[PDB]
């Protein structure tokens, strides 16, 4: 720990002078203890002239005091002298012209000391940002120049500081205010301290530094004055560490290293810094409940253990019996609900020596003057008023329409909320008080609310302690309580019977308390005093063990985690946490204006989000971390009408009489009108096209119906209590929800009944954790939870457990899959993940930069490295090869909305353009294929009123129209202003029919559960001239809603089987009977071969059914050897296939930034690819003999293909040079290369093309795919016709004519083993098995390769 520590803050954030009071009191105590003289006695002979910097004056005086009394040596002496000099320099007057410069430099020195004195401390870039802000806020100079001139002028400052210190010490060695104005001078230095001490700060002023029970005194002052010259003259020695010269030198070095109208208004706001070495105890906790203001809950500001426990809920009125504990609530020691326990409506106003003490419902004291009974008053920083009445009843206006009346029953000593009111809702809670021995005891709560009426009768024992909370006339108590002989609430049984047990020591302090499941949360307090702070708390098993240590001098707490990793929080006098210094040194900050509203938040990683409010106290400028200014505007009624996002796109609004938004004119002008019911709820919303959606609510306010824009109403039903008992679909299908009435999970969702009669059953514990889920088929998925409550095991229907392990902080430590392969996670002493064993021994090491963002991922082969922007959006990635050294870099650019705007890599650059609303309107894709003249493919998007996509002009000028019906339902897909399919939809807006342009008529019929039940395709009109396509697929599902049979007309009956989890383990049919063997993790196994392992432990299969695989050190397949085939895959640093050598026929692949293959070169043949997002819209082929382009048209918002139209030429794309190129040539695309051949797809239930038909309706192409995508036989009428051939496969895939690998977007899917040839780019975010494709290909897709 540094010998001397400080609290650097802003002048605006502090209104009281409590810290100044503490410093003055400490000085007075030192004077009394040493010189035996009060400040008044020494005031006379204290005529010394100094600048009117009260902060610097107090700091210097306090500094001088410690130096004279408390002697220090070593580095501690150097630091103390440095801080004394820093406080002095901003204190002496002459020269007057430099007073502002010196008083600005003093907080600079304070900040550099606070940030450099720490062991392994440095000037982070945020430090330089803060220094620049503080400097510029006052003189508006340059940080480098100011620091340099200070360094050159340091000697004069130190000389004048020595003179000032000599003068100050020449006031005591010999035996006998509130304005920080540079131009004002203190005639006497003692006078401001005396004036401070007189101020009624209302903050405890007990000195926190004890003198040494010694003597010396004047001897001490003589020694101090003698050594002042020695300690200050040597301060300038930059060679000496931890000195003003060293601070300036280090700050300059950091600045040099890191260099490679409304602003002025906020400068007047007071972002100027200010630091003190002594601070007063926080008055109380802040209203904030964030992780920075209270632990997982000891509030840091006061160290009070408060636990808010809800006993029962009255759903029809929205009342939860929140019992609030506060180990510092000595006023509620005799509280009827339990000692130091607060129930709802127990807040009251007590009488003390100071005056009236109000204890809000949250448990936060608010001392009020004795004049509240005679006049109105308002507590600062909250915004609620107290007003009296002639009848002695005090009304609290907490903010809103609620007025709470308080009455006194004993000489105006205790004011108990007799009842409340609500001129608005016309409601009002009535509290009936039983009086005994002049002690008012709450007896009945009358909830005379229009929602419902209740009589919360209470029952007391001999001690007058609530033992049961009844309702109206119910025999069952909503809440039962038990108290030990000391009056402590040692057990609180809620309405469901789930007891909570509380353990107290002999002083009403809660040491341990168990949740409803029996899991304790132990606590220990520094002492048995009522106000003693909680200093330690750990779950019963030791997890989450946290040690709080409050700094003796400052308003700081060192919150040690389970591994003694401190996190030093600093809080204001009101408890607001204005700083958070992590163990690694990253400091988060929070500025606050006089009203304690945040105006600047420098996060740990440097992100800064400011909040400039208007004269009406409304945030009218939220500058983002990226520099985007969002200027809100408000109308005369104080309503947010006009919002202006960073790009200038203005969201207008208009409000009705009830301050509800009745209009919403987005930037493009698509007005969205709402309507509300008298209860201030959305009853009806009108879109921009006129579509009207009607919403209905019941007496409770729970939505009970939603009439879609097309007159389709789905009704939600609720019992009297308000628990959802059914939700009916637009076609009258009821999903009835059933809740438990007894057991551990009483009152929770016990089961769900589905429209086909199948019942899901659940099981929870008392705290809501799922313990056992039974699926519709009866398969049980038991979950096991460890002592701390975190999931520790999940036993699925096969009895295969994914055992998790968590370290003492609740972070995942080791994850064990079904194969007993351990996925070790490693965390550095600072608590960041810095390792990952990936089930295969592949250790990924994570590095972090000074901003704490991920900096490198050192995989065994590739060393990823990230470069970020000021906002933290990645600016580039650098995948260096640790062995070969080849480096691949991607570069990103973002607009002011934080949306990707230009992504580039070696072989592409994608420029994304967006309209005011933020939707993609243009997408220029600058291909950079090697050996090929660079060319640009230009996508366009035209949108309708409701933001749907209605027209996309593909690069070669071909336009795909989506003619939309209503609120986004497609009734036809055009193609060059020529229809290619027209849909017909049912009540639920499900497609029940589509008329293809080739005269075919595909009707889909869905069963009760909405699963596809049949699919017939046939011509609208039949002709004997030719054999038009005609086939059908009737799908039958088993109890688990897994496709268990298909009555296909072409393939016959396809019967499937599944294992309990849901993995497909067989698929029999006439064509081929198949069987699959998955290990517990999910890897296909070669069961037929005995020597093959029974489980692929590392998830990387080395052999499966005649294919032997060879993986590199990153888990990607680098070779696949079988009978007569030797495929070698070359993976780039992004783990992407950039070359394939199949029996010597080398291929070459290339990808844009997003992993979308842009080409595939095979000797002279080149297959360009084009994407409009995640979908391969077109592909173009270049070769000596065959040139063609295919345009794949997919169904709306899906990867299922619809038709492919092409022309016998290479695609016509915008040759790279911009604004002139696309628009002119895109109109040259309006001339267009006419699509020669159309061909329509016909997929199965999951979107896999099963056949194809030309424009005349005939079948032209059939594929018999194996279950896992492997092509078994293709029946094409014209093999050579490239437009009658299909390379599409499982939804989102593409067959490769050279490798037989299906190219998913991000990975290559190798159908033989039904697993990707490389590990998932997103690691475990995709699943436990990172190489497996899917469990069930009949209903799961994985279209993007993740």
Author numbering: 14 to 189, 204 to 287, 298 to 333, 335 to 1255, 1267 to 1395
Text lifted from the article:
Single particle cryo-electron microscopy (cryoEM) of the purified wildtype Tse15 revealed two major 3D particle classes; both monomeric in assembly but one that resembled the expected β-cocoon of the Rhs domain and a second that had the Rhs domain with a globular protrusion at one end (purple and yellow respectively). A map of Tse15 was produced with the clade domain present at a maximum resolution of 3.08 Å. Following refinement and manual adjustments, the final model of Tse15 spanning residues 14–1395 was produced that resolved the structure of an α-helical clade domain (residues 14-333) and a core β-strand rich cage (residues 335–1395) (in orange and grey respectively). We could resolve the cleavage point between the N-terminal clade and Rhs domains, with the sequence matching the previously identified cleavage site and a clear break in the connective density of the polypeptide chain. The toxin density could be observed lining the interior wall of the β−stranded cage and appeared to have elements of secondary structure but not an overall globular fold. Between the Rhs and the toxin, there is a clear break in connective density that corresponds to the cleavage site of the toxin as determined by N-terminal sequencing (L1395). We were able to de novo build four separate peptides (chains B, C, D and E) into regions of convincing density, placing a total of 106 of the 195 residue CTD toxin (blue). These chains were modelled as poly-alanine with some glycine residues placed to allow an improved fit to the density. We also noted that the short helical chain C (10 residues) was localised to the exterior cleft of the Rhs domain, suggesting that this is indeed the point of toxin entrance or exit (blue). Also localised close to the entrance and chain C was the longer chain E (43 residues) that appeared to interact with the end of the clade domain, close to the cleavage site.
